[PDB]
Specification:
parkinson disease (chains A, B, C, D, E, F), mainly beta, homohexamer, Alpha-synuclein (chains A, B, C, D, E, F), cuprous ion binding (chains A, B, C, D, E, F), 75 residues, oxidoreductase activity (chains A, B, C, D, E, F), 0% helix, nucleus (chains A, B, C, D, E, F)
Chain lengths: 75, 75, 75, 75, 75, 75
């Protein structure tokens, strides 16, 4: 004869900007099996494949994925 | 004869901007099996494939995925 | 005869910007099996494949993935 | 004066069971943020959390996630 | 004056069971941030958390995640 | 004056069970940030956390993650 027994007898400050999660990317699972990509750029800008990116700027101009083809100022 | 027994006897400050989740991307599952992409740019801007991106700007102009083809100021 | 027994008898400040997670990317799993990429650039900018990136700027202009094709100022 | 130019001048057996993908699991992205699980088993079987599993059996009985609580044969 | 130029001038057996992908798991991205698990087993079987598993059996009984609580044969 | 130029002038058996990928797990990315686990076993079997496992059996009974709580044969 086999016996198995188990028992459990269980008796019984301002915070102005304190705890903030700001500019956060947490938890990402990405899979790419067969992705062919081909880019031909002539005199401009090309931005591809920007993933899992975070930033926080204070008193400044912040851009994650920005592209400007050309800037010309002549006199 | 086999015996199995189990028993459980269970008896028994301002916060101005304190706890904020602002500018957050959490929880993303992405799959891409066979995605062909082809880009031909001549004198402009092209922005593709921007995923899982977060940011927070304070007193600034923030753009995630912005594209300006050309800027010309002549005199 | 075999016997197995187990028992558990269990009886019994400002924080201005203190604890912030800002500009953070935590938790990323990425797989790429067969990804062919081909880039041809002539006189511009190309930015591809930017992943798991974080930054925090204070009193400055911060850009994660920015591309400017050309800047011309003549006199 | 700036100049950017680009040019591309482009001129120009039985197979009985040969190429089979059988019993395959390819391409899976899974995320679990806050999953609490609690199992209490007394004298039986419990099978949880079986993911991304493949097998191929030839001339045999194959079971991926099978559970039999008890088998009793007395004389 | 700046000049950028680029040019590309491009002119110009039985297989019985030969190439099979059988019992394969290829390509998996999994993330688990905060997963609490608690198991209490008394006299049985418990099988949890079986992921990214493959096998191939020939002339045999194959089980990936099988659980039998008890086997009793008395005389 | 600056000059940049580039040019590319491009002119110009049975296989019974030969090439098989069988019982294979290739390509896995797993992240676990804060996973608490607690197991209490009394007189049985517990199998947890089986990942990235492969096997191939020939003329035999193969089990990846199997658990039998007890086997009793008395006379």
């Amino acid at each position: 004869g086999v016996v198995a027994a188990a028992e459990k007898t269980k008796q019984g400050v301002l915070y102005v900007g304190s705890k903030t999660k700001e500019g956060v990317v947490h938890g990402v699972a990405t899979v790419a099996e067969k992705t062919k990509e081909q880019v031909t750029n002539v005199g401009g800008a090309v931005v591809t494949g920007v993933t899992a990116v975070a930033q926080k700027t204070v008193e400044g101009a912040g851009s994650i994925a920005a592209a400007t083809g050309f800037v010309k100022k002549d006199q």
